């Protein structure tokens, strides 16, 4: 059973802006996704201070970067708080309608696409490099779900019966044919060092 949803008009417009605008500094997508993972990890860290049983689904708080040259995918895995099915559907737990507005008002006021994260809609910068994005998530209060979208105004949600994660979120970037540089170890290392060198959780770059 696959459910198909329409993006809210402001999100479809934000996604069209990211896909169609000429902007060479595409590498910021990784900073934005690592920042989202760090926010999810802060959230489970905080919640577990009062209820340590919330870490029954996994005590390790980390981020893994997994390139796969054969599948042409870059996967960002975190063991953060995860998202419920409702959260996924409601713009991946973001304030995307009000954030898209504030980002649009900022762009007209002298901002560039790299400031997207300040408006809480940094997730959608994944479409700077990916033709398709799959989000696998597991929250303690819900089952494991897979969100997916190739943009074009719609997304799907289905239960994920493949590899249970325990808790957290997996962002699978199906890279555009001319964005394969983001599968190279030296390029990922460079971007992590430049934009995410002081994240409060271990970032492990997997090798092939
Ligand atoms: O899976 C989750 N759970 C998350 C939880 C948070 C924080 N959620 S909360 O605290 O409910 C919130 C919502 C809206 C505004 N302020 C705070 C942030 C990112 C999360 N993520 C997450 C989201 C994206 Cl898009 C991602 O790339 C990776 C992630 O781990």
Distances (CA, A) of 131 to 11, 65, 148: 16, 19, 11
97 annotated to a ligand binding site: yes
Q: Going by CA atoms, what residue is nearest to atom 7 of ligand 1?
A: 40
Give the separation between CA 186 and CA 47, rounded to whole angstroms.
36
Domains of the chain: 1-208 (3.30.565.10)
Ligand 1 atom 30 nearest Cα: 37
Alpha-carbon distance 18 to 9, whole Å?
A: 14
Annotated binding-site residue? 56: no
Sign of the Cα torsion 90, 93, 98, 104 reads negative
| DSSP-derived 3-state class of residue 91 | helix
Please choose from 169, 173, 196, 203 the residue to mutate so as to test ligand 1's pocket, defined by most ligand atoms within 8 A of CB: 169
* Cα–Cα distance for residue pair 148/135, rounded to 1 Å: 6
Contact in structure between 13 and 100 (CB atoms under 8 Å): yes
Sign for the CA dihedral angle at 7, 9, 10, 16 comes to positive
Q: How far is the CA of 40 from the centre of ligand 1 (A)?
A: 5
Q: Phi-psi category of 92—alpha, beta or left, where left has phi over 0 and alpha has psi -120 to 50?
A: left
Q: How far is the CA of 207 from the centre of ligand 1 (A)?
A: 27
Distance from the first to the final alpha carbon of the chain? 34
Q: Which of 79, 67, 72 is nearest to 206 (CA)?
A: 67
- What CA–CA distance (Å, rounded) separates 202 from 171? 17
Which H or E run contains 17? Answer: helix 9-20
Going from the Cα of 37 to the center of ligand 1, the distance in angstroms, rounded, reads: 7
Q: Is the CB of 81 under 6 A from ligand 1?
A: yes
- CA trace torsion 130, 146, 200, 208 (10° rounding): -60
- For residues 121 and 11, what is the distance between their CA atoms, to the nearest angstrom? 9
Query: How far apart (Å, rounded) are the C-alpha atoms in residues 94 and 107?
Result: 19
Structure solved via: X-ray
The secondary structure of residue 69, as a DSSP letter, is T
Which ligand 1 atom minimizes the distance to the CA of 81?
3
Residue 64's SS3 state is: strand
Strand pairing class (154-159; 145-149): antiparallel
Note the maximum CA span of the chain. 47
Nearest to 92 by CA among 47, 31, 41, 133: 133
Matching residue, tokens 């954030």: 99
96 lines ligand 1 (CB under 6 A): no
Tokens representing 3 are 């459910």
């Amino acid at each position: 059973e696959v459910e198909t949803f329409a993006f809210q008009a402001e999100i479809a417009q934000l996604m069209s802006l990211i896909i169609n605008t000429f902007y060479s500094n595409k590498e910021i997508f990784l900073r934005e996704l690592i920042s989202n993972s760090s926010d999810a990890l802060d959230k489970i860290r905080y919640e577990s201070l009062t209820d340590p049983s919330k870490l029954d689904s996994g005590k390790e708080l980390h981020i893994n970067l997994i390139p796969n040259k054969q599948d042409r995918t870059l996967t960002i895995v975190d063991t953060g708080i995860g998202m419920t099915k409702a959260d996924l559907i409601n713009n991946l737990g973001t304030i995307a309608k009000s954030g898209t507005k504030a980002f649009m008002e900022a762009l007209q006021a002298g901002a560039d696409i790299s400031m997207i994260g300040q408006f809480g809609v940094g997730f959608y910068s994944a479409y700077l490099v990916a033709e398709k994005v799959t989000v696998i998530t597991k929250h303690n209060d819900d089952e494991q779900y897979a969100w997916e979208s190739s943009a074009g105004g719609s997304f799907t949600v289905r239960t994920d019966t493949g590899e249970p994660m325990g808790r957290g979120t997996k962002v699978i970037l199906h890279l555009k044919e001319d964005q394969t540089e983001y599968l190279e170890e030296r390029r990922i290392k460079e971007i992590v060092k430049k934009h995410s060198q002081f994240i409060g959780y271990p970032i492990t770059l997997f090798v092939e």
